[PDB]
Design a protein around this nucleic acid. Structure first.
Ligand SMILES: Cc1cn([C@H]2C[C@H](O)[C@@H](COP(=O)(O)OP(=O)(O)OP(=O)(O)O)O2)c(=O)[nH]c1=O
Ligand SMILES: [Ca+2]
Ligand SMILES: [Ca+2]
Ligand SMILES: [Ca+2]
Ligand code: NA
Ligand code: NA
Length: 328
DNA sequence: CCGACAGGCGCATCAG
DNA sequence: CTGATGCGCA
DNA sequence: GTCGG
């Protein structure tokens, strides 16, 4: 991953992870990621802090840190953070799926600071954590698109075995066209589940159950009526190493709200934050279901009509961006 | 110079 | 039990 | 940490 301002964006990303995991300051995390991201799309080699301060999201303090990074090749503030035992122990435990900043601090206080520690205090972990630990190495591996293509095929073919009326669409980075993905995201619709009625129950469960039967889904992290979060694995063949286990998310979204749903799930996460914050500036709030006007006194009005992804962009006066131009 | 920062699902836990 | 909140997650 | 009203 060698890149134009890679030094700088790496440094800001690290600082965002610190603020999230150690400081627990969600808005500093966001503001660092917004700055990283804006710098990543800037097509000159940045030469000074002052030059970077021109970009939206970059202010006084990131500017000063860029000056230092460029002059000296590193940042003191990060040099200190990396030596701090506590800080890096908390950062590390957060890499386990299901451990966030709070739980990572509470383990480090109790003396649980390493993977060997996690692996001998099984009893201290809830179900999700336990599976996140079981598949720790596997979930930090990326998924080549060619494997995403096989996993897609399995998911869509089994969904079809349950009910030809389902539509399953693979989203996230896959739909943006990335050559590798962190995990699989499937958006599910069925004619029976619309914003005005649920004419059938068990619509998600039945899909989960079928994918368990053919051994594709192997564990469940959480499961509700519209959202499944778990683990899957491709079948392997005689004499080969098994495929690593992979994180999978499935979201059943009412069929009439497909476009807001797939906007949401196509992301990126940062792009969604930007696009939703722009909507607010303009008098609208967008979620995975609707786009709605904002009333003088904070009150969200009625859902606007939407019949394309592009409709949502028009409302807030954005030129349409193709999924592949929503990355970073 | 200060409020607002994206939006919501599922699980865990607490007061009543 | 319900309802409220915080956590970790997409 | 940054920014618009
Ligand atoms: C993490 C996250 C995701 N999302 C949305 C947009 C994401 O593209 C989508 C799925 O989340 P992810 O699977 O975390 O993201 P991704 O598919 O874009 O990236 P990767 O290749 O690393 O797996 O959910 C949010 O809206 N907010 C969030 O905080
Ligand atoms: Ca984690
Ligand atoms: Ca993904
Ligand atoms: Ca995901
Ligand atoms: Na700026
Ligand atoms: Na196996």
């Amino acid at each position: 991953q060698e890149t134009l301002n890679g030094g700088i964006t790496d440094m800001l990303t690290e600082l965002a992870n610190f603020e999230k995991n150690v400081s627990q300051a969600i808005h500093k995390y966001n503001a660092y990621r917004k700055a990283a991201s804006v710098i990543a799309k800037y097509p000159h080699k940045i030469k000074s802090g002052a030059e970077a301060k021109k970009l939206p999201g970059v202010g006084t303090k990131i500017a000063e840190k860029i000056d230092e990074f460029l002059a000296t090749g590193k940042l003191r503030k990060l040099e200190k953070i990396r030596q701090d035992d506590t800080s890096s122990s908390i950062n590390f435990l957060t890499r386990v799926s299901g451990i966030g900043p709070s739980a990572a601090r509470k383990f480090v206080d109790e003396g649980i600071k390493t993977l060997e520690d996690l692996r001998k205090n099984e009893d201290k972990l809830n179900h999700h954590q336990r599976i996140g630990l079981k598949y720790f190495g596997d979930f930090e591996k990326r998924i080549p698109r060619e494997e995403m293509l096989q996993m897609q095929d399995i998911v869509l073919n089994e969904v079809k075995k349950v009910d030809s009326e389902y539509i399953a669409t693979v989203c996230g980075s896959f739909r943006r066209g990335a050559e590798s993905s962190g995990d699989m995201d499937v958006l599910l619709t069925h004619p029976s589940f619309t914003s005005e009625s649920t004419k059938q129950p068990k619509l998600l469960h039945q899909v989960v159950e079928q994918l368990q039967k053919v051994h594709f889904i192997t564990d469940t992290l959480s499961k509700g009526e519209t959202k499944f979060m778990g683990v899957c694995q491709l079948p392997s063949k005689n004499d080969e190493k098994e495929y690593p286990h992979r994180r999978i998310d499935i979201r059943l979204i009412p069929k009439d709200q497909y476009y807001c749903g797939v906007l949401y799930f196509t992301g990126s996460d940062i792009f969604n934050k930007n696009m939703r914050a722009h909507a607010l500036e303009k008098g609208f709030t967008i979620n995975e279901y609707t786009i709605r006007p904002l009333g003088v006194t904070g009150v969200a009005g009625e859902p606007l009509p939407v019949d394309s992804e592009k409709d949502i962009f028009d409302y807030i006066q954005w030129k349409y961006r193709e999924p592949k131009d929503r990355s970073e």
